[PDB]
Amino acid sequence: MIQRTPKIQVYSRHPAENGKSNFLNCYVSGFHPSDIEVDLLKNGERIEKVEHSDLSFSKDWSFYLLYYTEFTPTEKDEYACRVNHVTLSQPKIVKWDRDM
Amino acid sequence: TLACFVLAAV
Amino acid sequence: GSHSMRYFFTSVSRPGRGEPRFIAVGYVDDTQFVRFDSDAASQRMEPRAPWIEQEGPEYWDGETRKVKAHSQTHRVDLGTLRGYYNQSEAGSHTVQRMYGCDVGSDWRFLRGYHQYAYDGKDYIALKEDLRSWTAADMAAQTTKHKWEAAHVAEQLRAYLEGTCVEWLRRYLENGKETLQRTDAPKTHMTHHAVSDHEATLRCWALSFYPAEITLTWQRDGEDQTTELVETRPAGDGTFQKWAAVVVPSGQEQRYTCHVQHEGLPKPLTLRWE
After folding, report:
1. Which of A5, A14, A40, A61 to mutate to test the interface with C (most CBs of C within 10 A)?
2. Effect of altering residue 56 to R (chain C)?
């Protein structure tokens, strides 16, 4: 077993534009095994209906999943992705950055 | 379409 | 333009959480089109693309039957593998299967594969000749024996060289507007002053398809030392990707971003200005 820690990208489907509804994405990948906790946070509380893609893997056998939810970007509303996995000492939180 | 035949067990 | 069809299978034992999980997903190129989730409600193969929806009950019934058979085989394998490695039925384990085929720009068979893995490590795989096997360890040796004696190879080769290829082609026309498309990357650059001495230049590529792409940074027209993020899915069938470089203030114009994608007539060159 080569326990693989999940990579994390937090981003939106379309370029973020205050007012225009969008989709908040969290893309976890390169992890193993496939059991994984992924939440989207809004100002610190998790969002209710979060859908994800079906499970699949890469050439090296590592897994990848896309989590998403409708959201309307606004300042100063803050979003982040919470990811809990076995290879992690504690849940990793990545703040969403439209800025990127 | 998936493979048609039955897959041998390991 | 090359093309491919892939099926990815995930089998997961979960002691104290019920019966084994089984998931199957099918891809044509970078687009998924089908799925099966033993935890889902339908218990059938499901369309994950608009163009596959127009397949008749004959197709779906057939695919459902096969994926169920696939499931059963993996259910057995989970226990067998426990035995080979002397593992108690308390630990959680994963099995992975991947098969599919490749076609050249002429839509003719290039190559097929059948890779099998246990707990994230190679287990057994079908050699390119589609006639022999590669066993990762001594355990897979026993499986290699079995499969040789059962002539699994020729069975798979038939599928990979024929049916697999024929259906890839069929899908390619059925999903012409989707699969046989190229979406040229929408580009733009953003300058962000991190420190007082250093600023970051990020080169953006959005809404492109397929996923293949290359982003390069040059200083004075010379390749660069650079953060290149793994290409990510937009969630709408397209992909994103950005490349960044940390440049000293005032020396911004020294840098140029170079984007290439088969959707572009020729490469693009972006500068911050």
Report:
1. A61
2. In allele A*30:01 and allele A*31:01
Residue in the structure block whose two tokens are 């326990």:
A3
Cα C187 to Cα C240: distance, rounded to the nearest angstrom: 10
CATH, domain range C1-181: 3.30.500.10
Reading the block at residue A65, the tokens are 């999943």
Q: Which residues contact C204 (CB under 8 A, 6 or more apart)?
A: C186, C187, C188, C189, C190, C240, C242
Q: How far apart are CA A19 and CA A51, in angstroms?
A: 22
Q: What is the resolution of this structure in A?
A: 2.8
Q: What is the CATH number of domain C182-268?
A: 2.60.40.10
Interface with chain C: mutation pick from A40, A55, A98, highest number of C CBs within 10 Å: A55
Interface check for C7 against chain A (CB to CB < 8 A): the answer is no
Nearest to A54 among C25, C236, C242 (CB): C25
CATH of the domain at A47: 2.60.40.10
Q: Where in chain C is the domain with CATH 2.60.40.10?
A: 182-268
CB contact C242 to A (< 8 Å) = yes
